[PDB]
Amino acid sequence: RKLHNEVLGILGRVGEGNLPKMKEELTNLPIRQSTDKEIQDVIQVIFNKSIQPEDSIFVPYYVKLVVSLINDIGEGEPAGRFIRNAIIRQCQRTFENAEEAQAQLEREIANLPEEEAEQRRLIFAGKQKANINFLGLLFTHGLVREKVVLHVLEWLLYGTERKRRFPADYELIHFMNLLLTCGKSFSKEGQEFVPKFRAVLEELMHMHPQRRMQFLLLNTVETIDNNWILEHHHH
Numbered sequence: 001r002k003l004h005n006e007v008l009g010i011l012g013r014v015g016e017g018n019l020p021k022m023k024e025e026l027t028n029l030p031i032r033q034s035t036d037k038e039i040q041d042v043i044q045v046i047f048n049k050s051i052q053p054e055d056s057i058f059v060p061y062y063v064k065l066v067v068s069l070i071n072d073i074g075e076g077e078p079a080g081r082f083i084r085n086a087i088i089r090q091c092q093r094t095f096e097n098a099e100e101a102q103a104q105l106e107r108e109i110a111n112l113p114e115e116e117a118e119q120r121r122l123i124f125a126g127k128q129k130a131n132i133n134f135l136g137l138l139f140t141h142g143l144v145r146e147k148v149v150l151h152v153l154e155w156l157l158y159g160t161e162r163k164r165r166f167p168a169d170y171e172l173i174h175f176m177n178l179l180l181t182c183g184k185s186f187s188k189e190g191q192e193f194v195p196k197f198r199a200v201l202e203e204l205m206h207m208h209p210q211r212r213m214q215f216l217l218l219n220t221v222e223t224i225d226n227n228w229i230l231e232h233h234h235h
Helices: 002-013 019-027 036-049 058-071 076-109 114-140 146-158 171-184 190-204 211-231
Strands: none
Touching: 002 019, 002 036, 002 058, 002 211, 036 058, 036 076, 058 076, 058 114, 058 190, 076 114, 076 146, 114 146, 114 171, 114 190, 146 171, 146 211, 171 190, 190 211
């Protein structure tokens, strides 16, 4: 496909210096005159390149191209509405896969030796961090629903079967990195996403947390608040 390769090209050459040239190269593509399959493919391509562990650095640029694309084609346009529903569907697929991959791992290493289960958990974490990073970047750029973030954190902290008292070790690390991304910011976008992430953590608090779980969520919201009052200091 012609439109497929052109998007790949843009994602390749995108960096800090040429992001405005890349945004205008993307708007210059005939997306409004493209089929449902062609548009769905563009979103699928960006979402796959974004969950590759090698790209962690360029992922904010991929996500900034998607913001650019929906800022060009508005929700009052047929293609604008379609792109938005394709992002919803592709978020669902990406984080549903991430959830099931976690569930599969735990079933696969349940009867495995202790030292083997641990090494398999480390191998998985390296792949899972790419998803969690992507979730954070989509959230800070307003591309993923607050509800998706909440559902991921539910299985990430309470387990895939939701029966955990406290999160597993590699799960806690994915959360701290998510916390660093979504829990703090001085940017004009930060003004809205930092209270949104705090709200998500307040919801998990009304999901019957135990002693360590309540201390985790309360101390996190407290640190978010401390850092918030600090970033909103004047004169």
